[PDB]
Amino acid sequence: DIQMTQSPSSVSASVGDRVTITCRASQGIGSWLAWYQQKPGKAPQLLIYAASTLQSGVPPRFSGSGSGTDFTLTITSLQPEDFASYYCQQANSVLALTFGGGTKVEI
Amino acid sequence: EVQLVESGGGLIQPGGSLRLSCAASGLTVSSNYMHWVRQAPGKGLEWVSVLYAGGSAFYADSVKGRFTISRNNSKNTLYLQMNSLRAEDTAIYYCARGLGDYLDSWGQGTLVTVS
Amino acid sequence: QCVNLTTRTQLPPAYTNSFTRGVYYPDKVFRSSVLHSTQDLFLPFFSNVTWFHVIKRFDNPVLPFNDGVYFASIEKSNIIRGWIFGTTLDSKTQSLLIVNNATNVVIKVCEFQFCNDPFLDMESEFRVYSSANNCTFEYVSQPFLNFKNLREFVFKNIDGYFKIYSKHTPIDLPQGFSALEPLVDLPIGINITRFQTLLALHRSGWTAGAAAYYVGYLQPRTFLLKYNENGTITDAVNLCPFDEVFNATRFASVYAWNRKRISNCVADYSVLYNLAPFFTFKCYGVSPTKLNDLCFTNVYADSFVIRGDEVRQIAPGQTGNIADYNYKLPDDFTGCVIAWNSNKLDSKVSGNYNYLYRLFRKSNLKPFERDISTEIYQAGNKPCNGVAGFNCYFPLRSYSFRPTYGVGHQPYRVVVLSFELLHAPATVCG
Amino acid sequence: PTESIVRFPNITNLCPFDEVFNATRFASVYAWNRKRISNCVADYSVLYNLAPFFTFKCYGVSPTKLNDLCFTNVYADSFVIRGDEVRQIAPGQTGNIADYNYKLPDDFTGCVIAWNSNKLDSKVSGNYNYLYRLFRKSNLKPFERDISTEIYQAGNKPCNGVAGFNCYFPLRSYSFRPTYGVGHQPYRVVVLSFELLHAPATVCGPKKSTNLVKNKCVNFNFNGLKGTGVLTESNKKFLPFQQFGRDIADTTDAVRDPQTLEILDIT
Ligand SMILES: *[C@@H]1O[C@H](CO)[C@@H](O)[C@H](O)[C@H]1NC(C)=O
Ligand SMILES: *[C@@H]1O[C@H](CO)[C@@H](O)[C@H](O)[C@H]1NC(C)=O
Ligand SMILES: *[C@@H]1O[C@H](CO)[C@@H](O)[C@H](O)[C@H]1NC(C)=O
Ligand SMILES: *[C@@H]1O[C@H](CO)[C@@H](O)[C@H](O)[C@H]1NC(C)=O
Ligand SMILES: *[C@@H]1O[C@H](CO)[C@@H](O)[C@H](O)[C@H]1NC(C)=O
Ligand SMILES: *[C@@H]1O[C@H](CO)[C@@H](O)[C@H](O)[C@H]1NC(C)=O
Ligand SMILES: *[C@@H]1O[C@H](CO)[C@@H](O)[C@H](O)[C@H]1NC(C)=O
């Protein structure tokens, strides 16, 4: 019924650049988006929740802005420490979260 | 200040019975939702299983059957049990905890292979 | 497998008198030298029957079976074979099939798919039905069989009984009197409202001989029967203002659903039965058609706003977060739930935070119970005194509304009507 | 009035009556089956030693007089219904069940048998093996089959199939949970309808043969009909279909006994 997809697949950029990674949704989700990181061989970590707020302990680098469909993550400076994957989480009334593909950032 | 431990990995034949353990540290599993997630090599996360805080469990269309979850409050350890598995079902498994519409707690995993 | 015929000739039907036809034994009892009166479906004297002649001529029309039929047919060389009784004559209904071949007589009822023109054709061709899949009742009976032969048949369908009447005797319709003894009683228990006959065609091709049969109607009339010593028959003679709860601008909270009690009026369900915007009419226990007939002693109304997901999840066979920690339906529910889209309103420029619902609870919630979610929630070993900690927080959450959601991801105006049974007198019955 | 004269019609091998009872797969309430049972032993007395009835109310027939009446026509039916609607089987009762699926006529003779089903017909999942009818434009004739698959019409707008609001499915399933409730527990109902008509008996109970005695004023029992009188042959001839006769005063004066097949005038 619902499926998540991501147009970018592998974007390479320097520290002073914008990755411009977004997640495409067929229907509109209102401020219920979260972005995670997948480190190869390491446990995942939290970045944001509900696409408007910031989780405690997360450095102020990952942000987001979007009402229902167009969500784009903005990074002021691309640190070398957080080089992992990106995933978009959207849910209906029940807690049925949906995940799409992963985007890899390389030097 | 939250951590999770998992046990039960090993060698399991296809179409067999395997039991998984997830002991929460510092949290009581009877007052919050349990979450399961998979990370396949070269793939991403997707729904596995979520246990409610009460006596009910939610499954997807493909995993509607063959699954039976009976948590134990004596040791605060989550239990996952299945009776049949396929060749495409092997990856790393994580038990997780979180609030509504987003999950926070994570941990390590146990790897199982079939042939 | 059927073959259409295009050589049929159209002629107006003819009529024949029915002086002394349509008399049978009222019951299996026997009486002698005594006059007895019965109230049963007979054929009144000096009635009107329709003259059908077969000779090419292949008049096989279809007539409705309003009441019992009297079948009189002068017969030679075994022209007619049987009759078809059925409502619509298709696989959607059960229809009879009577055929008497060269060996025996079989009575089979199934979902026979009769073609436009069913007939029969030594005889080795039977084009009557295509196939059947779900039928059980099958019966096999003994063979019942210048012109010199006449047959009389009377078929009645009362109390789910199919009684056939047969009489064989040697000989326009001749004038005379004869008996008609019952032969076979069969409890088919099926609805019959139309009938048609069967004609057999002999190849040379498809030739029909000189045969004729009569179709008559039966009417209730008392008759007198006279017997003798030999044991034979000789001769016979204040409305509720529902617009307030169905057109209110604002509703209550999801968790704090409003409780209302309105009574002392009549139930005019046809007012909201013909409304345009609503499309959900799910009901359990009591059918909506009967709902305007029976009397209910309790009427309850609920006022809350929620999307169609909870409208579909209100059934007790499925659970959910709201269905387990906020509001659940009792297993013995007999009411109905009505919801409709309200996308024209309740959508401002910014999000709306006026509706909240519960998320976490220790156990299940008893139905139709009022609960206030204002205390802090604890999950770890150490509780908090209202502190928004890592494990301790407020279960309540806000709502986000935009005009660009999916097909079913929109809030709906939901009203719940519940019916209860009690020994108290009903305050609303109309 | 010392002893009888003739015996009841000859008995044969006992019918497989254990097939209709103790069943594992019961038919639907609307798709009930019919079968013919004849020419065998009437053994309804063992049903008391079988599982208890608790719904053995009958109208017009005694519960323990079935041995001596020997009804000639049987009608075995398989019904499924909940425990709340077991009291709706009585005739002259309205309701959706008693007007859309099956109803009892006023002149009905006999009674039905129902019993609890707590041990079987229940599992962890819902039992969706039985369906009923809820919507029709007309009522029911007594003892009339009703197999419907066409969609119901609700309004002037035609419906090709299922609709959200315009039309509804006429068939609905059953929800039989183990903890649903005792009042909603499904009950298996079997129908045993009689005729109470003087007919040539083809099935009867196991009785004792009696030698024929004539010209004696002793009592007799002809197919459950009692009386006193003398037996004497006459010159009247009866049709093979006809069995007995009646006079002007509606008093039986003749009977057709099995096997021997003589006149045996009552008085
Ligand atoms: C029978 O009906 C036809 C027309 O339907 C009429 O012409 C004829 O006179 C009628 N016969 C009798 C005996 O009433
Ligand atoms: C003839 O009828 C008997 C029973 O009436 C049936 O068993 C048999 O199959 C029929 N034969 C043909 C050729 O239709
Ligand atoms: C009717 O027959 C079809 C086979 O053509 C079968 O699939 C279906 O289940 C049957 N229906 C009933 C009620 O037996
Ligand atoms: C009645 O039967 C007797 C012999 O039993 C016979 O002589 C007489 O002709 C019969 N009556 C008629 C009207 O045939
Ligand atoms: C509610 O209002 C609409 C139009 O505003 C009207 O068509 C409808 O009949 C009203 N509801 C009732 C119950 O009168
Ligand atoms: C029916 O089943 C019960 C189960 O215990 C059994 O006792 C009884 O004998 C059975 N009925 C017959 C006629 O065998
Ligand atoms: C039998 O069919 C007729 C014609 O369609 C209909 O009017 C009548 O209501 C039906 N009877 C039953 C009991 O369904």
List, in sequence order, every beta strand (DSSP E) within C258-298: 258-260
Instruction: Give me the residues paired with residue A65 across strands.
Output: A72
Q: Give the chain C residue nearest B98 (alpha carbons).
A: C391
Q: Give the chain C residue nearest A56 (alpha carbons).
A: C390
C381 touches chain B (CB under 8 A): yes
Cβ contact D72:D203 at 8 Å: yes
What does the block give as tokens for D59? 């109208």
> What is the H or E stretch that residue C217 is in?
strand C211-217
D237 contacts C31? CB cut-off 8 A: no
Say whether B77 sits in a helix, a strand or coil.
strand
Contacts of A93 in chain C (CB under 8 A): 307, 309-310, 320, 322, 409
d(CA C367, CA D84): 23
d(CA C133, CA C113): 11
Domain edges within chain D: 11-207
To test the pocket of ligand 5, the residue of C244, C265, C269, C275 to mutate (highest count of ligand atoms within 8 Å of its CB) is: C275
Ligand 7 atom closest to residue C191's alpha carbon, by position in its atom list: 1
CATH code assigned at A76: 2.60.40.10
B33 touches chain A (CB under 8 A): yes
* Among B25, B50, B57, B54, residue whose Cα is nearest residue B35: B50
State the smallest CA–CA distance between residue A43 and chain C in angstroms. Answer: 20
How far from B96 is each of B22, B51, C138, C319, D203, CA to CA, in Å? 9, 10, 64, 22, 73
Q: Are strands C41-42 and C219-220 parallel, antiparallel or unpaired?
A: antiparallel
What does the block give as tokens for C420? 């209860």
Q: Are strands B110-113 and B92-99 parallel, antiparallel or unpaired?
A: antiparallel
Residues 6+ apart with CB under 8 A from D245: C29, C30, C31, C32, D236, D238, D252, D253, D254
Quote the ligand 2 centre to C85 CA distance (angstroms): 20
Q: Is the CB of C242 under 6 A from ligand 5?
A: yes
Quote the ligand 7 centre to C190 CA distance (angstroms): 10
Phi, psi of B34 (to 5 degrees): -100, 145
* C72 assigned to some structural domain: yes
What does the block give as tokens for B91? 């990856």
Contacts of D247 in chain C (CB under 8 A): 34
C406 touches chain A (CB under 8 A): yes
d(CA C153, CA C218): 13
Range of A84's domain?
1-7+15-92
Q: Is the CB of D119 under 6 A from ligand 6?
A: no
Q: Are residues C147 and C292 in the same domain?
A: no
Residues 6+ apart with CB under 8 A from D183: D82, D83, D84
Give the one of C31, C191, C332 whose C-beta lies nearest to D245's C-beta.
C31
Domain total in chain C = 2
d(CA C216, CA C43): 8
Cβ contact D89:D189 at 8 Å: yes
Domain total in chain B = 1
CATH code assigned at C418: 3.30.70.1840
How far from C171 is each of C74, C167, C178, C281, CA to CA, in Å? 9, 12, 11, 67
Range of B62's domain?
3-100
Quote the ligand 4 centre to C45 CA distance (angstroms): 29
Quote the ligand 6 centre to D47 CA distance (angstroms): 10
Cβ contact C327:C365 at 8 Å: yes
Instruction: Note the CATH architecture for domain D11-207.
Output: 2-Layer Sandwich (3.30)
C121 touches chain A (CB under 8 A): no
Instruction: Give me the residues paired with residue D128 across strands.
Output: none
d(CA C100, CA C199): 12
Interchain contact C/B (3 or more Cβ pairs less than 8 Å): yes
Q: Are residues C188 and C161 in the same domain?
A: yes
Q: Are residues C248 and C174 in the same domain?
A: no
What value does the CA radius of gyration of chain A take, rounded to a whole number of Å? 13
d(CA B70, CA B89): 21
Residues 6+ apart with CB under 8 A from B23: B4, B5, B75, B76, B77, B78
What does the block give as tokens for C376? 């802090």
* C7 assigned to some structural domain: no
Give the one of A43, A87, A91 whose C-beta lies nearest to B44's C-beta.
A87
Q: Are strands A34-37 and A87-91 parallel, antiparallel or unpaired?
A: antiparallel
Contacts of D168 in chain C (CB under 8 A): 281, 288
CATH code assigned at B48: 2.60.40.10
d(CA C201, CA C190): 30
Length of chain D counted residue by residue: 267
> Half-sphere exposure of C270 toward its Cβ, with a 13 Å CA cutoff?
8
Say whether D18 sits in a helix, a strand or coil.
helix
> What is the H or E stretch that residue D108 is in?
none
Residues 6+ apart with CB under 8 A from A80: A15, A107
Helices vs. strands in chain B: H and E counts, helices first: 0, 11
Quoted resolution (Å): 4.5
State the smallest CA–CA distance between residue A85 and chain B in angstroms. Answer: 9
* B115 assigned to some structural domain: no
Instruction: Give me the residues paired with residue C299 across strands.
Output: C419
What does the block give as tokens for C419? 């019916």
How far, in whole angstroms, is CA C124 from its chain's centroid?
A: 38
CA-angle at D178, arms to D175 and D184, nearest 5°: 55
Cβ contact C152:C21 at 8 Å: yes
How far from B45 is each of A10, A20, A97, B92, D178, CA to CA, in Å? 18, 21, 10, 11, 38
Pocket of ligand 2 (CB under 6 A): C 101, 103-106, 126, 140
Q: Are residues C336 and C372 in the same domain?
A: yes
* B111 assigned to some structural domain: no
Type of residue numbered C207: T
Cβ contact A58:A76 at 8 Å: no
* Among C289, C158, C298, C230, residue whose Cα is nearest residue C281: C289
> Half-sphere exposure of A30 toward its Cβ, with a 13 Å CA cutoff?
16
Residues 6+ apart with CB under 8 A from D38: D72, D74, D202, D203
To test the pocket of ligand 6, the residue of D15, D21, D50 to mutate (highest count of ligand atoms within 8 Å of its CB) is: D50
* A107 assigned to some structural domain: no
Contacts of B26 in chain C (CB under 8 A): 380-381, 391
Say whether C322 sits in a helix, a strand or coil.
helix
d(CA D31, CA D26): 10
Say whether C263 sits in a helix, a strand or coil.
coil
Q: Which residues of A touch B (CB under 8 A)?
A: 32, 34, 36, 38, 43-46, 49-50, 55, 85, 87, 89, 91, 94-102
Range of C133's domain?
14-236
Q: Which residues of A touch C (CB under 8 A)?
A: 2, 26-32, 67-69, 92-95
C204, C205, C209, C214: CA torsion to nearest 10: 160
Q: Are residues C195 and C317 in the same domain?
A: no
Fill in the DSSP letter of residue B29: T
What does the block give as tokens for B1? 């200040």
DSSP assignment of A73-91 equals: EEESS--SS-----EEEEE
Name the experiment that determined this structure: cryo-EM
* C352 assigned to some structural domain: yes
Residues 6+ apart with CB under 8 A from B26: B1, B2, B3, C380, C381, C391
Cβ contact A95:B101 at 8 Å: yes
A43 contacts B106? CB cut-off 8 A: yes
CA-angle at A12, arms to A11 and A13, nearest 5°: 120
Domain total in chain A = 1
Q: Is the CB of C48 under 6 A from ligand 1?
A: yes
d(CA B14, CA A43): 28
Q: Are residues C221 and C332 in the same domain?
A: no
User: Residue holding tokens 């596995």?
Assistant: B48
Quote the ligand 2 centre to C136 CA distance (angstroms): 18
How far from D16 is each of B22, C138, D21, D47, D213, CA to CA, in Å? 59, 20, 10, 14, 36
Quote the ligand 3 centre to D134 CA distance (angstroms): 20
Q: Is the CB of C178 under 6 A from ligand 1?
A: no
DSSP assignment of C106-144 equals: EEE-B-----SS-EE-----EES----SS---EEEE---
B59 touches chain A (CB under 8 A): no
What does the block give as tokens for A81? 């420490």
> What number of other Cβ atoms are within 10 A of residue B75's Cβ?
11
Instruction: Give me the residues paired with residue C107 across strands.
Output: C98, C139
Ligand in closest contact with the CA of C270: 5
